[PDB]
């Protein structure tokens, strides 16, 4: 199943997008230029792209460290890359509240993977009508994402993005199961699939690795955040080249 | 360090605490029963008793699920379980703007173990200044726990309670490590551990007894709980040990 | 179900036993100081004692670290322990052709963690008819000791004993599921299961106290070391086993 | 580090070797049917091949199991395969007086998995000086792959193969970490890294197997290790494009 993000195509049989930008909203002109580097490159390369960044970061280093711009500069500056850019932007919601004004501005609104199964989040994102990113949290297998994409079915929306960002693993750690993607497809309607590397590693050699390998297995879409700005272009081109060669290539 | 909950004091060198209740509170007269049968069965046997419930079902089994009595009508029923048998009480809170009207009510509020790394429910929780139960995420480190413990701190409420319940094992699993009391008390300065035994679990009840002994052999402040008469059972059980265990020098 | 090893009961519901001692044996004089020290204490607090030794170590830190003494005079020195302590004594065999000879000495012998699933020793081993120690390897679910219980049972010696060493969680680390042990008991009759604390450590005396009372609350036949620190240690295990001991298993 | 395997180069730079065969040697009329299947179809494709097999099943499912063909036998029917075909071949060694025979014909050995820390398995091994494949246990992180290495090296044999195949994760389960083959390369050298896909699945189907080749080999490796009305062929087809891909890559 295939979703129409204004004029991008997202599905597991696509050409991948490209979900990136900044953790945190913290300036105007800051994000419109580092926004404009992940545009000019994507454009380069034809890799549909769209802008990722919080408003506010509910789950922070410590508790004094910069939220984020908030909820009304937060979409204004959305407002101004959509505008600038013409891109669709992308942007987590931490209250049932926040998902009409949000989803308003924004063109995918993200369910935070600790927040994935608060029923009064996903019912409140739901009744949207958006577009929606469900964060696959680190201690949820593969096949409990059913449950959460069910939830949001029988709320009336299955516009509906099933994101990797690895399980937990002993202590501190982190694997992606690459066998995951596939249950997810198999047991979801074969939604779209797309691999948040960033969060799923702790290094630009590990991300690239990590990244490949993800992609290697036919997915809608690869998710990231960046400070390395300059290498992405590198980075892309390698992306691009092995998700061509499988795209190109009939399921089996 | 202990706390003082009323009269009940709760610390990791004194007698165990039992925190038992409800899943989610219905009305007003099943949960009367619940509590009835708890202080009945622990008055007889001793031991301080803390009575936990919800007020809310966060995760819903459907989205047309019950969710239970809500925030006004939960803490109508505390108020009375309180009035009714003089007991401390202990509830989760979901969101930041609850935490002050749940803390006039509630004795203990909890941090719900999704929710331990969300900045503005800690700030809220601590505000409060109340007595708080830190779930322990099952995807977090007993060694990470000494920086939720900090946050509470600089948001200044350090009558902090540390709450196991169990880590992530693979898939749809889990394994609590005997070993993370010890770690916990060392790098969060000796703060009231106890052990949530029953949603460290998912011959059913011989497993709660075998876990709720091995967890209290390592010398707990308490047991958290949510459950023939199969509670005075387990707690004759769990009494003899916590008494031995406490009795050694440490 | 109970064992007897010569004077000794060893069951989920007997005093504990206590398996300890040297790594690898040297010498004569050399291992009967080391016991004599494990004899005394635990002969002063009543607790029943197995001496602990390898002769032969196949998993060694080096390649050249001191394998031991092997099989030849490895048997004397058991045999010197046993007339001098009137103890029984365990050690771990890794081929076939070696179980024989070692049986003629040593009351039980011990299967390695790592040749667990080897047929040929499990068969052979069983062959001898002596009480055999299989250590959980820590990639194997407490469920699967089943399969090598039955293989033994195949083989003509039920006469066996489950030891626990702690579980792979994620990396290098190990963890002991307390929950392991019942399921251990009720899916292999109920064989004597005992808890090797060391290995199941990564140690820190504090934690091996811990992990150790940790899993004597769950009632088991024994406790198993791969080490006045003892006696204290011992005093511990031994108030809390008395204690889950003397109570009926939940009615 | 590269390692010349007769006219076979093998390194984590180089076009994939596929090591593949069967679990263990029943007939000789039935290993060639299976060789020269896998021999026809890597030709055309170009990829180079070395044959594998066991000729011992040293974990029956039972006491009374199908061992296998045994030493004897399997020796003469892996001389055999090189003689017709004129390929190498790789097989599993479980004893140190086995090592030297076999190493006099099988041009790779390998370690079992079980086996990792035998230390006089691993000497035997290291001593015959022919290529070594590795099996990395469940249980071991890709960063103490290094001190098997470290064994190897010590003993004086440099020519060894990591080979992959899953990590523990939880009970009866196995997770394959993308980035330990990063770790592995880093940490020991750039020795060969090969990926043992069959056995990384067969806790969990050819569209598994498939997705979870392709992501390990999207990670740059020297091989793709595996056991089995044309699906070698279309599954090599598809590899071989990926390495194709990404061994064109600078890296
Ligand atoms: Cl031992
Ligand atoms: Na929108």
Redesign the interface.
Known sequence: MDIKINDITLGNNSPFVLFGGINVLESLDSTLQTCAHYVEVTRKLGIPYIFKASFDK???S???SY?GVGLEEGLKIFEKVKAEFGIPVITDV??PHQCQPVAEVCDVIQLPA??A????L??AMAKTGNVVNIKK???L????MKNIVE?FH??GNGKLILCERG???????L?????G??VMKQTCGNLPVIFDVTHSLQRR??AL??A???????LAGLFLESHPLHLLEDFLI?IK??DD??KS?PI?
């Open positions: 509910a789950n922070r410590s508790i004094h939220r931490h209250e600790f927040l199964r608060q029923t009064d996903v019912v949290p680190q201690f297998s593969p096949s409990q939830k029988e709320a399980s937990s693993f002993g202590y501190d750690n694997v992606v199961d690459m066998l993607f596939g050699a590990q690795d990590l490949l390998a993800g992609m290697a297995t036919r390698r080249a092995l060669l499988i290539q089996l």
